[PDB]
Amino acid sequence: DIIIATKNGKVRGMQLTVFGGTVTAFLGIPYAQPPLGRLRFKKPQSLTKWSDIWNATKYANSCCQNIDQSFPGFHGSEMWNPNTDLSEDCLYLNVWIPAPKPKNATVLIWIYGGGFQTGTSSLHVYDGKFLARVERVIVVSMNYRVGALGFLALPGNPEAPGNMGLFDQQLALQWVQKNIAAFGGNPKSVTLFGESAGAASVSLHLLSPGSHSLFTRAILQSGSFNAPWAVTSLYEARNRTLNLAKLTGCSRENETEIIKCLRNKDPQEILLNEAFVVPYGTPLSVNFGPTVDGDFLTDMPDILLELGQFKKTQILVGVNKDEGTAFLVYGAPGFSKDNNSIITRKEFQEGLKIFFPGVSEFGKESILFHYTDWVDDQRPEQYREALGDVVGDYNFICPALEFTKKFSEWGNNAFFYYFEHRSSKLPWPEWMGVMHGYEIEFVFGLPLERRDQYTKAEEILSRSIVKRWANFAKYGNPQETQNNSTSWPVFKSTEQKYLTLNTESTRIMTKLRAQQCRFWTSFFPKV
Amino acid sequence: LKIFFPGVSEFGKESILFHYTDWVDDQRPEQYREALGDVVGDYNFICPALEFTKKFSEWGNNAFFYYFEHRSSKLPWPEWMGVMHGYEIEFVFGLPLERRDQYTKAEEILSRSIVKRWANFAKYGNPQETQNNSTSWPVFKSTEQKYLTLNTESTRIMTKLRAQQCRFWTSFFPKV
Amino acid sequence: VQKNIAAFGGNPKSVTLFGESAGAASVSLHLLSPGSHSLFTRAILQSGSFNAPWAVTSLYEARNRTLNLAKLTGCSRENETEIIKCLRNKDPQEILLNEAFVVPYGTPLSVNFGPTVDGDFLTDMPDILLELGQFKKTQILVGVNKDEGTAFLVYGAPGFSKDNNSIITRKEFQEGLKIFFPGVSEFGKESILFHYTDWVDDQRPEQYREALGDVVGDYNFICPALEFTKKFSEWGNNAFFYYFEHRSSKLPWPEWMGVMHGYEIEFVFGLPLERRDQYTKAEEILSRSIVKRWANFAKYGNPQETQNNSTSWPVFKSTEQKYLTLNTESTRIMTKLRAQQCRFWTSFFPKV
Ligand SMILES: *[C@@H]1O[C@H](CO[C@H]2O[C@@H](C)[C@@H](O)[C@@H](O)[C@@H]2O)[C@@H](O[C@@H]2O[C@H](CO)[C@@H](O)[C@H](O)[C@H]2NC(C)=O)[C@H](O)[C@H]1NC(C)=O
Ligand SMILES: *[C@@H]1O[C@H](CO[C@H]2O[C@@H](C)[C@@H](O)[C@@H](O)[C@@H]2O)[C@@H](O[C@@H]2O[C@H](CO)[C@@H](O)[C@H](O)[C@H]2NC(C)=O)[C@H](O)[C@H]1NC(C)=O
Ligand SMILES: *[C@@H]1O[C@H](CO[C@H]2O[C@@H](C)[C@@H](O)[C@@H](O)[C@@H]2O)[C@@H](O[C@@H]2O[C@H](CO)[C@@H](O)[C@H](O)[C@H]2NC(C)=O)[C@H](O)[C@H]1NC(C)=O
Ligand SMILES: *[C@@H]1O[C@H](CO[C@H]2O[C@@H](C)[C@@H](O)[C@@H](O)[C@@H]2O)[C@@H](O[C@@H]2O[C@H](CO)[C@@H](O)[C@H](O)[C@H]2NC(C)=O)[C@H](O)[C@H]1NC(C)=O
Ligand SMILES: N=C(OCc1cc[n+](Cc2ccccc2)cc1)C(Cl)(Cl)Cl
Ligand SMILES: *[C@@H]1O[C@H](CO)[C@@H](O)[C@H](O)[C@H]1NC(C)=O
Ligand SMILES: *[C@@H]1O[C@H](CO)[C@@H](O)[C@H](O)[C@H]1NC(C)=O
Ligand SMILES: *[C@@H]1O[C@H](CO)[C@@H](O)[C@H](O)[C@H]1NC(C)=O
Ligand SMILES: *[C@@H]1O[C@H](CO)[C@@H](O)[C@H](O)[C@H]1NC(C)=O
Ligand SMILES: *[C@@H]1O[C@H](CO)[C@@H](O)[C@H](O)[C@H]1NC(C)=O
Ligand SMILES: *[C@@H]1O[C@H](CO)[C@@H](O)[C@H](O)[C@H]1NC(C)=O
Ligand SMILES: *[C@@H]1O[C@H](CO)[C@@H](O)[C@H](O)[C@H]1NC(C)=O
Ligand SMILES: [Br-]
Ligand SMILES: [Ca+2]
Ligand SMILES: [Ca+2]
Ligand SMILES: [Ca+2]
Ligand SMILES: [Ca+2]
Ligand SMILES: [Ca+2]
Ligand SMILES: [Cl-]
Ligand SMILES: [Cl-]
Ligand SMILES: [Cl-]
Ligand SMILES: [Cl-]
Ligand SMILES: [Cl-]
Ligand SMILES: [Cl-]
Ligand SMILES: [Cl-]
Ligand SMILES: [Cl-]
Ligand SMILES: [Cl-]
Ligand SMILES: [Cl-]
Ligand SMILES: [Cl-]
Ligand code: NA
Ligand code: NA
Ligand code: NA
Ligand code: NA
Question: What is annotated about its quaternary structure and interactions (chain C)?
């Protein structure tokens, strides 16, 4: 019976057998007051404190959110869907600790993605027990509010100030600072890591002064705040809040009355109307996301980045070879996970309309122009791949690369990776390639489980990635020093070296997507 | 190894075996087949070419190094033999520019570019293709050791070709 | 020392650790242990460092040896705590008598029960900590003796004896490698043979005798010491490296064993300053100088002898790799000690 005394009371964990060893898991520890009733849309409130023992022996409720119903019965989509009951009462976290209890272990804190609209820490691919077992780090993950319930903004108004889900995360980091030493952890060696919106969140914690003292360094997988889906403008945020009020019959004159009316609506009515606060959504639509609130975010984050206003520390940043492909089957014409998705020029053009709704004709043409000068054989998969690269480069790769350059210009060591391995177990079709989100299971060491039907090469790759991540967290340097591995050089804005991650030849390369990113970063913002 | 290294000691043959047979790591059946190809290739061609280039460039002259990675669509030899010895020649001499000869369009494009780089090298001492946004070919220095890959798809700048293997052949093996 | 030494007139803020062999390995481990960071100022490592192959026991070995000891003492249980409790009732003699056999094949340098990665004193594999700069930032003084390996040859190697010149044949040399490299492949032993047996070139009969001494010395002491020093200095700290080349006039061991492992210690502790002890005048002078250099290192972080026109001791950088020779005659600055041999041991041999 493993009981840990926290600042708020006792918690009971459970023993897990992992790899002929033991891990102690505490699943579903509360870290805030349930944000119900008058607390909906408000910042998370501190916890009351309890006598008796809290049983942290099962995952807690996931936060309210719309579920992906595009492919019912299909494991490729459904593996991302919540695997616990949805509730507003969802502010809980998980802790995995090595057995026997470590003395001063580095802590890795996971922040899930899901476009700030979806996600939960209880997903199978986020199971921290392997990292705990293999590297003897402590792994922490938390649920945070998503969608309108987490990011509804009426700027300056504390009844709905925006960024609630980010403050949820922040309160969790705080919990780690105050409690993790009791679990055998070192609060002075905390590394945040997250993927997609989780990665954007991480990058925002690097920018928020309230988060400065709550962590040591950061790992950003397929995401950063400067991605075009990551930050909602104040103009948009108010138009969307008002549109939601209209849909729910909560339109008032007094802005506080609106929020009070929204506070009486059932979560389903809010969730059902979130989709329509925008006239034209994209498959990457972030209806309710981070805003410049003047609290968590003191200024427009591009300005803070440009002018060196962020936590000075090491970062590890990276992206996957085919970031954009997954999004094409959620709207783009001619695309399907059930055929090779050979699309014509006209279908490509229509595709741009879907992914670039408010963009001028000239703007769409310029994308077409940059991505359609073939080299040079008229392969039929020409437009199919171009559209994937368009969506991937614009939304993920180029912003990640720009973030890394800007951050490193202020003197901090940065390491950049390019993930190129397609899972042998991928349920999605071959044309989709090395997909968005499919490095995660390697980071969390799923292929170390020899039962799971991954190949031997995949076990080796995962083991190496796990070691590099752990060394980064512990020592700020993502080397694998024992097995004649390729040394990972720092990324400087000059040479721009990056490391390829694959099952065969691990290589040092330079200037990822140089041509494409000049288009997106320099030219396209003017459009 | 006996066939390719007749007068070499048992220990010498073992050391080759040792360097080329620590797999990474799946027990693919083509393991030894490919290792022997790389042994013969690295020892007889690649490592000496790389050593020559380093030594020559140390005396101040510009040098350019390429790695040819395209297998002819018309190759009569089997697939396992890959990008064979001698099969860059037809690209240098511009055979695939003849649209009758049943080479692919990509191969025509590659040959045209190689022909231009060779010609510019001969005329001007600099193997650039300057007109078609081509990858710039950097000089090879004994330090960074940059080289250019020649292929039908992505033309790239890389460093330290066969670093591990060539240290074995160039430093250790001559002592054997 | 931190809590009490001020009462003895000492300065707890000026503490220098020094040790030889396993003592030196211990010192190097204190540089790595966070619990030892605030307990000393700098470090002197004589003929030893944690990265020497005898210095750290793997977790795999440690458990196999613990269990083997339990077996020998009749303390085998299922519960691991019961084992220790059974071992706690054994008389020390029974434990000591069985320590030798927890290993199937020991060497003259067998460290049956040594440091391990415990997750307390040592938070991680120390090669990883060294490589990634995770250690106390301060000055070190490191060094080795000219004939580290010779002493170990008379404790097992065939044809060797302290009572004759120990001229061994090729076959005896090969058998010697078996003794010193038990779990190593045939190819691995061959590669050692190959590297150390291309003579230059006269067929002197003491050829194999000296080669085996150098093999054991370079592998176990010199190359690890040099690697430690390079790695430690790459993170910006001043380091000083010495090569001790003086054979004591009072050495009871035979001449062929040369400048032996452990025989710099008496010079460091200043025994030859005692004019009664039958050391030579030159040895008194050398010891006095070494004592001053050690003291200046401890007091000021710089092992100079500044008063008697002594050779200045340059810092060791991973580039030039300068080191100072310690001898009774000409004190010299040299570079890249055992360059050829150490490339073999440090780069190639670990793969074997
Ligand atoms: C901010 O406000 C309006 C949004 O109007 C919205 O009303 C919501 C309740 C919801 O139904 C949503 O779909 C709807 O768009 C935007 O103006 C819209 O643009 C259309 C263009 O056809 C106009 O017809 C309307 O003014 C309005 N929608 C409709 C059909 O009523 C406005 O553009 C927006 N600001 C933006 C997005 O920049
Ligand atoms: C690949 O599939 C798409 C998607 O739509 C189809 O999916 C098929 C697997 C099948 O189940 C079919 O019933 C379903 O409609 C195909 O695009 C569709 O093409 C048809 C005409 O051919 C159009 O009428 C549809 O609008 C269009 N759907 C979309 C989403 O635009 C596509 O043709 C197919 N490509 C192939 C066969 O290579
Ligand atoms: C870890 O375990 C065994 C050690 O077995 C040992 O039993 C001890 C009580 C002691 O007597 C010791 O000498 C003995 O070796 C190792 O296996 C040994 O290897 C020999 C090879 O001949 C085998 O016969 C046995 O399995 C065993 N020894 C004997 C004779 O019983 C095992 O290899 C070791 N792991 C290592 C050292 O890698
Ligand atoms: C140097 O001595 C060794 C060690 O063994 C011998 O030591 C001698 C001083 C003497 O007291 C003798 O009784 C003792 O055995 C000699 O090696 C030995 O050689 C003999 C045969 O010549 C072998 O039968 C022994 O196995 C072997 N001992 C060992 C430890 O292997 C060695 O020959 C001698 N060398 C000389 C004389 O130069
Ligand atoms: N893109 C979204 O919805 C479409 C969408 C929904 C769910 N997913 C999960 C997923 C992830 C990687 C590969 C395949 C599926 C992707 C895209 C947001 Cl993030 Cl909710 Cl805005
Ligand atoms: C906590 O869990 C244990 C499981 O054995 C149980 O004994 C205890 O009553 C639980 N406490 C609850 C349910 O409040
Ligand atoms: C853990 O390490 C920190 C520095 O990282 C140290 O200050 C602290 O005392 C340690 N905690 C322990 C071992 O209790
Ligand atoms: C808005 O309503 C709130 C709650 O009744 C009230 O406190 C405030 O006075 C109102 N604001 C204005 C200026 O109408
Ligand atoms: C190092 O290599 C060995 C096999 O030689 C393997 O067992 C181990 O998992 C590797 N370590 C890492 C971190 O990749
Ligand atoms: C340059 O590109 C054009 C097509 O845009 C082509 O006709 C020409 O052959 C190319 N030149 C070289 C030398 O590759
Ligand atoms: C081992 O024995 C100790 C002492 O009796 C006891 O505390 C412990 O429960 C035992 N462990 C197991 C799991 O058998
Ligand atoms: C310096 O030289 C003098 C003799 O000239 C000697 O007495 C003294 O011991 C020397 N000092 C040291 C530290 O070697
Ligand atoms: Br995702
Ligand atoms: Ca690519
Ligand atoms: Ca590698
Ligand atoms: Ca090109
Ligand atoms: Ca010498
Ligand atoms: Ca002198
Ligand atoms: Cl209310
Ligand atoms: Cl911190
Ligand atoms: Cl057109
Ligand atoms: Cl830094
Ligand atoms: Cl470059
Ligand atoms: Cl020139
Ligand atoms: Cl490089
Ligand atoms: Cl101190
Ligand atoms: Cl022989
Ligand atoms: Cl210094
Ligand atoms: Cl020199
Ligand atoms: Na709900
Ligand atoms: Na948006
Ligand atoms: Na040992
Ligand atoms: Na005793």
Answer: Homotetramer; disulfide-linked. Dimer of dimers.
Total residue length of chain A: 527
List the domain range (segments joined by +) for residue A312. 1-527
**Residue for token digits 């709905």?**
A160
The whole-angstrom distance between residue A55's C-alpha and the CA centroid of its chain comes to 28
Residues 6 or more apart from B79 whose CB is under 8 A from it?
A: none
Q: DSSP secondary structure string, A6-57?
A: ETTEEEE-EEEEETTEEEEEEEEEE-S----GGGTTSPPPPP---SSEEE-B
- Domain count within chain C: 1
Does residue C82 line the site of ligand 11, with CB under 6 A?
yes
Ligand 8 closest atom vs CA A257: 2
Active-site residue flag, C195? no
Q: Which residue has the tokens 């869907």?
A: A81
Tally the C-alpha atoms within 13 A of residue B2's C-alpha that lie toward its C-beta. 0
Tell me which residue of C118, C99, C122 sits closest to C29, measured CA to CA. Answer: C122
Amino acid symbol at A451:
R
- Rounded to a whole number, what is the distance in angstroms from the first to the last CA of chain B? 14
B146 Cβ contact partners less than 8 Å away, ≥ 6 residues apart: B65, B138, B139, B140, B157, B158, B159
**Are A322 and A436 a contacting pair, CB within 8 Å?**
yes
d(CA C316, CA C321): 5
Structure letter (DSSP) for residue C221: I
Signed CA dihedral, C295, C299, C301, C305: sign only: negative
Q: Residue C159 in contact with residue C166, Cβ under 8 Å?
A: yes
Q: Verify whether residue C21 is a known catalytic residue.
A: yes
Q: What is Dmax (Cα atoms) for chain A? A: 72
What is the helix (H) or strand (E) element at residue A94, kind and residue range?
strand A92-99
Q: What six digits make up the tokens of A195?
A: 């993927």
**Pairing mode of beta strands A508-510, A497-501:** antiparallel
Q: Which long-range contacts (CB under 8 A, 24 or more apart) does C234-239 make?
A: C234/C133, C234/C318, C235/C133, C235/C135, C235/C137, C236/C137, C237/C137, C237/C138, C237/C139, C237/C140, C238/C139, C238/C301, C238/C302, C238/C315, C239/C139, C239/C140, C239/C141, C239/C142, C239/C315, C239/C316
Q: How many residues does chain B have?
A: 176
Q: In whole angstroms, what is the distance from residue A404 CA to residue A398 CA? A: 10
Q: What is the spatial distance between Cα A23 and Cα A105, in angstroms, rounded to a whole number? A: 14
* A80 is an annotated ligand-binding site residue: yes
Strand ranges across the sheet with C42-46: C16-20, C42-46, C140-145, C239-244, C322-326, C333-335
Matching residue, tokens 């300053």: C273
User: C169-191: string of b/e by CB count within 10 Å (b at 16+)?
Assistant: eeebbbebbebbbeebeeebbbb
- Length of chain C as a residue count: 352
Mutant choice from A22, A97, A103 vs C, greatest count of C C-beta within 10 A: A103
CA distance C144 to C257: 15
Which residues does residue C44 pair with via DSSP β-bridges, in sequence order?
C18, C141
Of A375, A378, A508, the CB nearest to B159: A508
Q: Atom 23 of ligand 3 has which residue's CA nearest to it?
A: C104
Q: Are A220 and A199 in contact (CB under 8 A)?
A: yes
Sign of CA dihedral C216, C219, C221, C223: positive
CA A44 from centre of chain: 20
The H or E element that residue A188 is part of is: strand A185-195
Give backbone dihedrals phi and psi of C247, rounded to 5 degrees, phi first. Answer: -90, 125
CATH classification at residue A384: 3.40.50.1820
Cα separations (Å) of A51 from A8, A29, C248?
8, 14, 73
User: Could you tell me the resolution of this structure in angstroms?
Assistant: 2.3
Task: For residue A349, count other CB atoms closer than 10 A to its CB.
Answer: 18
User: Solved by what technique?
Assistant: X-ray
Can you read off the two tokens belonging to residue A319?
Answer: 């992206």
Backbone angles phi, psi at B31, to 5 degrees: -55, -60
